[PDB]
Design a protein around this motif. Sequence first.
Motif, PDB file in Angstrom:
ATOM      1  N   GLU A 163       0.828  -1.208   0.000  1.00  0.00           N
ATOM      2  CA  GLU A 163       0.000   0.000   0.000  1.00  0.00           C
ATOM      3  C   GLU A 163       0.861   1.256   0.000  1.00  0.00           C
ATOM      4  O   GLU A 163       0.559   2.219  -0.712  1.00  0.00           O
ATOM      5  CB  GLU A 163      -0.965   0.019   1.202  1.00  0.00           C
TER       6      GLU A 163
ATOM      7  N   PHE B 296       0.964   4.268  -2.666  1.00  0.00           N
ATOM      8  CA  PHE B 296       0.828   5.700  -2.377  1.00  0.00           C
ATOM      9  C   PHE B 296       1.945   6.495  -3.032  1.00  0.00           C
ATOM     10  O   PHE B 296       1.708   7.542  -3.651  1.00  0.00           O
ATOM     11  CB  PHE B 296       0.889   5.964  -0.862  1.00  0.00           C
TER      12      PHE B 296
ATOM     13  N   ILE C 210      -7.167  -4.764  -0.181  1.00  0.00           N
ATOM     14  CA  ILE C 210      -7.894  -4.009   0.846  1.00  0.00           C
ATOM     15  C   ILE C 210      -8.670  -2.830   0.267  1.00  0.00           C
ATOM     16  O   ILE C 210      -9.669  -2.390   0.857  1.00  0.00           O
ATOM     17  CB  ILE C 210      -6.919  -3.544   1.943  1.00  0.00           C
ATOM     18  N   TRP C 211      -8.239  -2.290  -0.872  1.00  0.00           N
ATOM     19  CA  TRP C 211      -8.934  -1.162  -1.480  1.00  0.00           C
ATOM     20  C   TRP C 211      -9.953  -1.570  -2.545  1.00  0.00           C
ATOM     21  O   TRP C 211     -10.598  -0.694  -3.126  1.00  0.00           O
ATOM     22  CB  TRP C 211      -7.919  -0.198  -2.100  1.00  0.00           C
TER      23      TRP C 211
ATOM     24  N   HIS D  25      -6.175   9.090   7.461  1.00  0.00           N
ATOM     25  CA  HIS D  25      -4.908   9.711   7.864  1.00  0.00           C
ATOM     26  C   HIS D  25      -4.835  11.071   7.194  1.00  0.00           C
ATOM     27  O   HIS D  25      -4.382  11.221   6.056  1.00  0.00           O
ATOM     28  CB  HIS D  25      -3.733   8.824   7.507  1.00  0.00           C
TER      29      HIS D  25
ATOM     30  N   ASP E 126     -10.264   2.402  13.712  1.00  0.00           N
ATOM     31  CA  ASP E 126     -10.792   1.122  14.177  1.00  0.00           C
ATOM     32  C   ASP E 126      -9.682   0.409  14.932  1.00  0.00           C
ATOM     33  O   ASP E 126      -8.710  -0.061  14.332  1.00  0.00           O
ATOM     34  CB  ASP E 126     -11.286   0.294  12.990  1.00  0.00           C
TER      35      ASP E 126
ATOM     36  N   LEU F  87      -8.817  -3.571  13.815  1.00  0.00           N
ATOM     37  CA  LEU F  87      -8.288  -3.939  12.501  1.00  0.00           C
ATOM     38  C   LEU F  87      -7.429  -2.859  11.859  1.00  0.00           C
ATOM     39  O   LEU F  87      -6.323  -3.144  11.383  1.00  0.00           O
ATOM     40  CB  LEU F  87      -9.447  -4.300  11.557  1.00  0.00           C
ATOM     41  N   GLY F  88      -7.901  -1.618  11.822  1.00  0.00           N
ATOM     42  CA  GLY F  88      -7.187  -0.587  11.103  1.00  0.00           C
ATOM     43  C   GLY F  88      -5.960  -0.028  11.784  1.00  0.00           C
ATOM     44  O   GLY F  88      -4.910   0.097  11.146  1.00  0.00           O
TER      45      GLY F  88
ATOM     46  N   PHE G 232      -2.399  -1.677  11.535  1.00  0.00           N
ATOM     47  CA  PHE G 232      -1.929  -1.472  10.161  1.00  0.00           C
ATOM     48  C   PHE G 232      -1.427  -0.038   9.954  1.00  0.00           C
ATOM     49  O   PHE G 232      -0.340   0.188   9.390  1.00  0.00           O
ATOM     50  CB  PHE G 232      -3.092  -1.818   9.228  1.00  0.00           C
ATOM     51  N   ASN G 233      -2.200   0.953  10.414  1.00  0.00           N
ATOM     52  CA  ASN G 233      -1.823   2.348  10.174  1.00  0.00           C
ATOM     53  C   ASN G 233      -0.558   2.731  10.940  1.00  0.00           C
ATOM     54  O   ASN G 233       0.268   3.509  10.448  1.00  0.00           O
ATOM     55  CB  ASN G 233      -2.982   3.287  10.541  1.00  0.00           C
TER      56      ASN G 233
HETATM   57  O1  LIG Z   1      -9.521  -3.649   4.501  1.00  0.00           O
HETATM   58  C1  LIG Z   1      -8.848  -3.023   5.308  1.00  0.00           C
HETATM   59  O2  LIG Z   1      -8.860  -1.678   5.556  1.00  0.00           O
HETATM   60  C2  LIG Z   1      -8.095  -1.302   6.703  1.00  0.00           C
HETATM   61  C3  LIG Z   1      -7.240  -0.180   6.222  1.00  0.00           C
HETATM   62  C4  LIG Z   1      -7.193   1.068   6.801  1.00  0.00           C
HETATM   63  C5  LIG Z   1      -6.377   2.040   6.261  1.00  0.00           C
HETATM   64  C6  LIG Z   1      -5.620   1.767   5.141  1.00  0.00           C
HETATM   65  O3  LIG Z   1      -4.810   2.740   4.583  1.00  0.00           O
HETATM   66  C7  LIG Z   1      -5.665   0.529   4.555  1.00  0.00           C
HETATM   67  C8  LIG Z   1      -6.479  -0.433   5.103  1.00  0.00           C
HETATM   68  C9  LIG Z   1      -9.240  -0.999   7.620  1.00  0.00           C
HETATM   69  C10 LIG Z   1      -9.381  -1.618   8.839  1.00  0.00           C
HETATM   70  C11 LIG Z   1     -10.450  -1.345   9.663  1.00  0.00           C
HETATM   71  C12 LIG Z   1     -11.410  -0.460   9.239  1.00  0.00           C
HETATM   72  O4  LIG Z   1     -12.489  -0.201  10.054  1.00  0.00           O
HETATM   73  C13 LIG Z   1     -11.315   0.160   8.016  1.00  0.00           C
HETATM   74  C14 LIG Z   1     -10.231  -0.128   7.219  1.00  0.00           C
HETATM   75  C15 LIG Z   1      -7.331  -2.554   6.942  1.00  0.00           C
HETATM   76  C16 LIG Z   1      -6.296  -2.812   7.801  1.00  0.00           C
HETATM   77  C17 LIG Z   1      -5.784  -4.092   7.789  1.00  0.00           C
HETATM   78  C18 LIG Z   1      -6.256  -5.090   6.958  1.00  0.00           C
HETATM   79  C19 LIG Z   1      -7.294  -4.831   6.093  1.00  0.00           C
HETATM   80  C20 LIG Z   1      -7.782  -3.548   6.135  1.00  0.00           C
END
Ligand SMILES: O=C1OC(c2ccc(O)cc2)(c2ccc(O)cc2)c2ccccc21
Lengths: 280, 278
Positions: free
Chosen positions: A61, A65, A82-83, A170, A192, A195-196, A199-200
Motif C-alpha cells: 500500500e 501511495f 484491501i482497497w 490519515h 478502528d 483492525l485498522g 496497520f496504520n
Molecule cells: O480492509 C482493510 O482496511 C483497513 C485499512 C485502513 C487504512 C488503510 O490505509 C488501509 C487499510 C481498515 C481496517 C479497519 C477499518 O475499520 C477500516 C479499514 C485494513 C487494515 C488491515 C487489513 C485490512 C484492512
Amino acid sequence: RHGELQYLRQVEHILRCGFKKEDRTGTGTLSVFGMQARYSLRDEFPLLTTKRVFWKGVLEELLWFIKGSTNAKELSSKGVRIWDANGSRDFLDSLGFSARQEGDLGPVYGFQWRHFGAEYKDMDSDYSGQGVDQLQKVIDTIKTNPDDRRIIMCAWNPKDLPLMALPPCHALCQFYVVNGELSCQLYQRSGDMGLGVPFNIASYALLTYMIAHITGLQPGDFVHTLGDAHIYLNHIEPLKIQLQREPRPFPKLKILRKVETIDDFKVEDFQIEGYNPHPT
Amino acid sequence: HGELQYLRQVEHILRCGFKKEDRTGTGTLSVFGMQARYSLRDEFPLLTTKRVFWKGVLEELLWFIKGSTNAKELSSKGVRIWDANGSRDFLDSLGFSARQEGDLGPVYGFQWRHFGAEYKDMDSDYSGQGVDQLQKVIDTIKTNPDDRRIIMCAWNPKDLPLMALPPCHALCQFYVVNGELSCQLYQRSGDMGLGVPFNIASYALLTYMIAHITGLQPGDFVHTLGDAHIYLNHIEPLKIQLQREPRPFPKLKILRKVETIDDFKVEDFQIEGYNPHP
Ligand SMILES: O=C1OC(c2ccc(O)cc2)(c2ccc(O)cc2)c2ccccc21
C-alpha cells in the motif's frame, strides 16, 4: 515498557469508558475522542504482536501511495485487495461515479501526496509536474532545514473530498528532527482499534524508516494521534482475550541496500526480522 | 483542575525537552508530540496562573469567522497581534513587495470560508468561492452528528507560498456524543509560554460558539501539539509560574440566542469569575 502496552491500554480505555456511537451504516461502536501514543522506532519496529498485522499489505500500500496511483487494481495486482471494494462498479455507481472505470478511487492518498491541488480527471491521466509534490517537499526540507516546524504532508483536501471514494482517515502527518533523529506524528481522524489502527501504525512507522534512510537520519518516534478511536461492538469479546496476551518483543526492520530517492524503494528492499505475533 | 495538564506539559519540556533552534536561530527546549484534554462542561479553560488576553482571543476569532485576511481590520479593534506579519517591512522580507500593508495572504479566514478559491488580495470579493468549511462543519453537526469527517483544515499546500505565515493551527476536528460537542486541534508548533494559553482559549471559544449554534452542550477541547517548545528566555518566568496554584476556571456566558455563526458579536460574550495571578 514494551511499546505495544500503550495500544493495549488504549483498547482497555475504550472498553471501560467509551460511549456507544454508530458509524455511517448504523453499526455500533464504543468510542473515545482524542488519544495519543508514542512508539519508539529506535532499533525496533512497532509491528504489533498481540495480533498479526498484514505486513505485505502495509508495504505494498505504501509503495502504491508513493507512486501516486489511485487505481485499486494496481494495488490488487500485488496481492493486496484491501482497497478493491472501494473501487468496485457498484460502490462507484452508488457515489455517482458512473463514468469511472472500475478501480478508480478518485484523488485519494497517492494523488494528494504527489499532486496536491492538481485537477483530477481519472486514474489513467498523466499528472506529471502538476500540483504540489508534498512528499518530495518534506524530504527536501528535512535535508536542508531539519529545524523546520512546517514539515507537513496533508492528504485532507476539502476541494477534492467529493471526488474521493473515501476521504482520508490519515488526514495529515508532520515530521520533526532533533539529535539526528527523524520523528513523525500522524493525525488520524478515525481509527478502528481492532483492525485498522495496527496497520496504520505500521504504515507510518515504515514511511518514517524510508524517509530517514534517504535523508541520512536515524528513526526517532512515531506519535499516533486519534480523533474518533473506536471498537466495533462485536469485537469486544475477542479483544478482551487479546488484551490478556503479553506482547512479544517487537521485530526489526532492515533496509537491504542504499536507496537514494523515495521513488526507488522496491518491495524486495525490506526485511522484517523476528516477527512473532500471537496466533488468531 | 484542568490547568494542571498545561503545567505538567511545561514541566515535561523543561525536564526532558531537547535544545532546538527556530527560524531565527534562537533557542528553545522542545518536545515532539503532546496532548491535553480540557473540559468545557460548565467551565471555560482560560488559564489562571498567568492572565490570558481574552479580548484578543475573542476579536481574532470573530475576525477569522468573517473571512478577513487584513490585519488592519483586527488592529482597529485594539488587537495588534497580527500587525507585524502584515507590516510592509515583513511582507518585503517574503518577496511580497506588491502587496498592500496588512494583507496577510490566504490565511485562516480565507481557508475557513473559501478553501480552494484563487486568492488575489485582501480586498477581493470571494463570495461563493471555494469551500466554506466553517458552515459545512455546522451543517454536518446539525444533520449527521455521528460523522467522523467533521474537519476544518487551514493547512492548504497550494496556498502556502502566498501566506505571510503558514497556520500553526493546521486543522481541527469536531465530534458529537451524548448531546455534547467536542473539538480537537492539531497545532504543529506551540510556544508554551506565550502562545499556547491563547490558542486553548481560541478553540474552546469556537467550540462554545458552534455548540450554541447547533443546540449542543460543550464537551472537551483536546489540544494536540507537534513541536511543543519553550524559548530559553522564558525558562525562569515559567519556573515561577509553575509554583502558582490554579484558581478555578471561569465560566463563559453567551448573553443571547444567536442563530448563525456570522451573527456573533463581542457583546454577546461574558467571562465570569476570571481571577488570574499577575
Ligand atoms: O480492509 C482493510 O482496511 C483497513 C485499512 C485502513 C487504512 C488503510 O490505509 C488501509 C487499510 C481498515 C481496517 C479497519 C477499518 O475499520 C477500516 C479499514 C485494513 C487494515 C488491515 C487489513 C485490512 C484492512
